[PDB]
Design a protein around this ligand. Structure first.
Ligand SMILES: CO[C@H]1O[C@H](CO)[C@@H](S[C@@H]2O[C@H](CO)[C@@H](S[C@@H]3O[C@H](CO)[C@@H](S[C@@H]4O[C@H](CO)[C@@H](S[C@@H]5O[C@H](CO)[C@@H](O)[C@H](O)[C@H]5O)[C@H](O)[C@H]4O)[C@H](O)[C@H]3O)[C@H](O)[C@H]2O)[C@H](O)[C@H]1O
Ligand SMILES: *[C@@H]1O[C@H](CO)[C@@H](O)[C@H](O)[C@H]1NC(C)=O
Ligand SMILES: [Mg+2]
Length: 360
C-alpha cells in the first residue's frame, strides 16, 4: 500500500519555470545547461508554510494535476505537499518565519488552516495527495525541551498534530510526520524517547488510516547511505538515514506504529557536505542534488526517496539587517549572499547541479 507506487509524481511548473527562466540562461557550460533542463522535471514537494498558500498554491497545484490526469496521464500524477504552519513554530530556533503564536490565537488560527486544507483536499479526492506534516516540530520534544519556548509549545504541538492527523485522514491522502534526521533523533540515546513519542501520538490519534509513517532529512543534507561517517557526524554511530531508520523502526513497531519512511535526498548527493557542524541547515556549502525521487528504494521500511526541499530555492537571507534574518544563514558554511527564503538562489542551484550525484 505504498502511496508512491502506481503514480507519477507531479513536477510543478513553478520550479520548472524558475529553472528555465532564471537558471538556464546563466549557464555557460553546455553540459550544465542540459542537466538543468533535466532537473526542471524532477518532482519536488510544494510548501504550505504560510496561510496564504492554502487558497492559492494548493488549489492551483491540485487543479493542474487534475487537468493532466483527465487528459490521460499514465500513470496518474500525485501531489506532494508540506503542511508547515504550527503556532510558536520552530520553537528551538533562534529565529523563525512562522506567522502564528500560541499567545495570539494561534491554536484557533492553525485549526482553521487545517480545516480549510481539508475542505480543499475533499474537493480534490481524485488527486492522490502525499503530505509531510510539520517539519521541525515534534522532534524538538525529544531533545530541545530545555529551551523554554519548546517546553511551552510542547502540549500544543502534540494536540495540534493529533488534530491534523485526524482531520486530514482522507481516503486519497497519505501522511508522514516529520521525524528529524540521523543527527537529531538518530543518536542512540534519542531513539527510544523518539519512538515513545511518535508511537503514542499515532495511538492517541486513533491510528488513522492515512498516517503512513514518518519523513526524515526534510530540508537537510544527510546521506541515505554513505560508507564512511562524515566528520561532523562523529561520534554518532547512526551517521546516515539508513542507520537511523533501521534502528528506529523496530522500536516504533514494537510500540504499535509500523511506520514507513520517506527520506529527503534533494540536497544529499555530495558526501561529506561542506557543513562544519551537523546542525548547520541554511544554504549549506558543498552540497549536490541527490538520488531522484522514486518508490524503488530497495528498502522495505522506506516507501520513497523524495525531494522535499526544492534545491535552488533559498533557505533564508544572509542580509543581517533583514527582520527575518536567521544567524545560521550567515555562517561561514552558508552560501552568501543569499536572497529571502523561498526566492530563487541561482548560485546555490548551480552548486547543486555541479555537485549532483548521480550525475544528470
Ligand atoms: C541531538 O540534537 C541536538 O543536536 C542536533 C544537531 O546534531 C540538533 S538537529 C537540528 O535542530 C534544529 C532545530 O532545533 C534544526 S533548525 C531548522 O531546520 C530546518 C531544516 O532546514 C528549517 S526548515 C526551513 O523552513 C523554511 C520555511 O518553509 C524554508 S524556506 C521556504 O521554502 C519553500 C520551498 O523552497 C518555499 O516554497 C517557501 O516560500 C519558503 O518560505 C527552508 O528551506 C527550510 O530550511 C528550519 O527553519 C529551522 O528552524 C536543524 O535543521 C537540525 O539539524 C538538535 O536541535 C539538538 O537538540
Ligand atoms: C488564513 O487564510 C484563510 C483563507 O484561506 C483566511 O480565511 C483566514 O482569515 C486566514 N487566517 C488568518 C489567521 O489570517
Ligand atoms: Mg542491511
Amino acid at each position: 500500500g505504498n502511496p508512491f507506487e502506481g503514480v507519477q509524481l507531479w513536477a510543478n511548473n513553478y520550479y520548472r519555470s524558475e529553472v528555465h527562466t532564471l537558471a538556464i540562461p546563466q549557464i555557460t557550460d553546455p553540459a550544465l545547461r542540459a542537466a538543468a533542463s533535466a532537473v526542471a522535471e524532477v518532482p519536488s514537494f510544494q510548501w504550505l508554510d504560510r496561510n496564504v498558500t492554502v487558497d492559492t498554491l494548493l488549489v492551483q497545484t491540485l487543479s493542474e494535476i487534475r487537468e493532466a490526469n483527465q487528459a490521460g496521464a499514465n500513470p496518474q500524477y500525485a501531489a506532494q505537499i508540506v503542511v508547515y504552519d504550527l503556532p510558536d513554530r520552530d520553537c528551538a530556533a533562534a529565529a523563525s518565519n512562522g506567522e502564528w503564536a500560541i499567545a495570539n490565537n494561534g491554536v484557533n488560527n492553525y485549526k482553521a488552516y487545517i480545516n480549510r486544507i481539508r475542505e480543499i483536499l475533499i474537493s480534490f479526492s481524485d488527486v492522490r495527495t502525499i503530505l509531510v506534516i510539520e517539519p521541525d516540530s515534534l522532534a524538538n520534544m525529544v531533545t530541545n525541551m530545555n529551551v523554554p519556548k519548546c517546553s511551552g509549545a510542547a502540549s500544543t504541538y502534540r494536540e495540534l498534530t493529533i488534530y491534523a492527523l485526524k482531520q486530514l485522514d482522507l481516503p486519497h491522502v497519505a501522511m508522514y510526520m516529520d521525524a528529524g534526521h540521523a543527527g537529531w533523533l538518530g543518536w542512540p540515546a534519542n531513539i527510544q524517547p523518539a519512538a515513545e513519542l511518535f508511537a503514542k501520538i499515532y495511538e492517541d490519534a486513533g491510528k488513522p488510516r492515512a498516517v503512513r509513517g514518518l519523513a526524515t532529512n526534510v530540508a537537510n543534507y544527510n546521506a541515505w547511505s554513505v560508507s564512511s561517517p562524515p566528520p561532523y557526524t562523529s561520534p554518532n554511530p547512526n551517521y546516515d538515514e539508513k542507520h537511523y531508520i533501521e534502528a528506529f523502526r523496530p522500536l516504533l513497531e514494537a510500540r504499535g506504529f509500523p511506520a514507513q519512511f520517506i527520506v529527503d535526498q534533494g540536497r544529499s548527493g555530495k558526501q561529506p557536505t561542506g557543513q562544519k557542524e551537523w546542525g548547520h541547515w541554511c544554504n549549506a556549502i558543498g552540497t549536490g542534488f541527490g538520488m531522484r525521487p522514486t518508490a524503488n528504494t530497495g528498502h522495505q521500511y522506506v516507501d520513497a526517496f523524495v525531494w522535499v526541499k526544492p534545491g535552488g530555492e533559498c533557505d533564508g537571507t544572509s542580509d543581517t539587517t533583514a527582520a527575518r534574518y536567521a544567524y545560521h544563514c550567515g555562517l561561514e558554511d552558508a552560501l552568501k549572499p543569499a536572497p529571502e527564503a523561498g526566492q530563487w538562489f541561482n548560485e546555490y542551484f548551480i552548486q547543486l547541479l555541479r555537485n549532483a550525484n548521480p550525475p544528470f
